[PDB]
Amino acid sequence: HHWGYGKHNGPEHWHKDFPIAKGERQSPVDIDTHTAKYDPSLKPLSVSYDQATSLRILNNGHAFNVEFDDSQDKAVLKGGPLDGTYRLIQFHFHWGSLDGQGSEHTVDKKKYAAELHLVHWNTKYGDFGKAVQQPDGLAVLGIFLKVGSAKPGLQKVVDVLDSIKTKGKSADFTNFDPRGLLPESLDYWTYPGSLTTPPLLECVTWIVLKEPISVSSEQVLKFRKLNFNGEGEPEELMVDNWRPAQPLKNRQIKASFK
Numbered sequence: 001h002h003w004g005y006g007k008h009n010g011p012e013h014w015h016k017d018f019p020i021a022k023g024e025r026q027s028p029v030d031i032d033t034h035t036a037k038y039d040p041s042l043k044p045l046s047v048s049y050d051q052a053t054s055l056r057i058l059n060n061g062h063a064f065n066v067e068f069d070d071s072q073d074k075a076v077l078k079g080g081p082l083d084g085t086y087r088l089i090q091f092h093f094h095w096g097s098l099d100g101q102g103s104e105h106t107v108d109k110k111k112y113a114a115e116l117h118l119v120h121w122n123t124k125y126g127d128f129g130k131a132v133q134q135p136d137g138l139a140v141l142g143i144f145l146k147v148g149s150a151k152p153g154l155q156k157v158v159d160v161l162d163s164i165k166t167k168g169k170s171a172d173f174t175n176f177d178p179r180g181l182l183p184e185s186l187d188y189w190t191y192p193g194s195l196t197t198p199p200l201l202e203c204v205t206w207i208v209l210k211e212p213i214s215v216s217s218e219q220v221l222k223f224r225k226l227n228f229n230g231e232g233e234p235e236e237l238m239v240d241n242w243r244p245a246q247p248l249k250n251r252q253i254k255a256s257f258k
């Protein structure tokens with residue numbers, strides 16, 4: 001009865017309504033560093049978020065999304081393994097109920113406390129709706145979060161969570177700079193995959209950053225006080241909204257560094 005991350009409608013049940021869940025290029029996957037192939041022909045990533053227009057933040061019952069104005073080429077991603085220009089449309093997180101779990105992708109079986117997804121769509125296709133119908137329609141920039149010192153750029157996001165506590169609530173969120181959530185280095189692994197939540201469409205080129213960002217115990221704690229439920233329903237904490245690693249099948253993970 002509409003997907004979730006619970007015992008009764010969680011990841012292992014998604015295949016009943018979304019048959020593609022057992023396909024050939026499903027995400028997330030485990031990054032085995034010793035089998036990733038160094039590819040010297042990969043180009044440096046090109047992140048241009050200087051004219052980024054954030055609009056609002058909302059709780060959709062699965063996670064919280066900060067949306068951006070993508071009517072024009074304001075914030076894009078170019079280079080790396082990409083072909084063409086991809087527009088930033090929204091970013092969201094996946095997190096756990098404990099510091100030792102949260103991320104969707106793992107590195108050599110190791111799980112991080114959470115994972116950030118910056119979602120972009122191929123401008124060649126006109127609009128997001130069309131992009132989700134093509135093999136190279138999306139580009140998701142994934143960043144891992146580990147518990148340590150505080151991250152300044154994340155605090156503004158943390159402060160407003162109280163106003164979007166339950167399903168369906170939103171709040172205006174203008175003038176937010178995404179550049180405050182990037183690690184120093186832009187080295188990455190890349191592979192062809194899918195969305196990690198229903199519809200689970202196989203239209204994504206995944207770009208996972210090697211270097212994770214640090215956030216405090218207090219910062220992640222705040223994420224854990226959100227609700228899956230809308231106002232007036234019984235309370236169900238929003239935690240562990242992540243999908244388990246899927247088999248790689250016949251794909252190869254390419255690294256941009258040695």
Ligand SMILES: C[C@@H](CNC(=O)c1ccc(S(N)(=O)=O)cc1)Cn1ccc2ccccc21
Nearest residue numbers: 117118119129132140194195196197198199
């Ligand atoms: C795609 C959904 C919207 N979902 C996403 O855009 C999305 C983006 C990134 C991730 S993640 N975590 O992999 O980065 C997950 C979801 C709408 N929608 C629902 C049914 C549906 C059918 C056709 C087209 C769009 C449709």
Ligand SMILES: [Hg+2]
Nearest residue numbers: 132134202203
């Ligand atoms: Hg697709």
Ligand SMILES: [Zn+2]
Nearest residue numbers: 092094117196
């Ligand atoms: Zn995601």
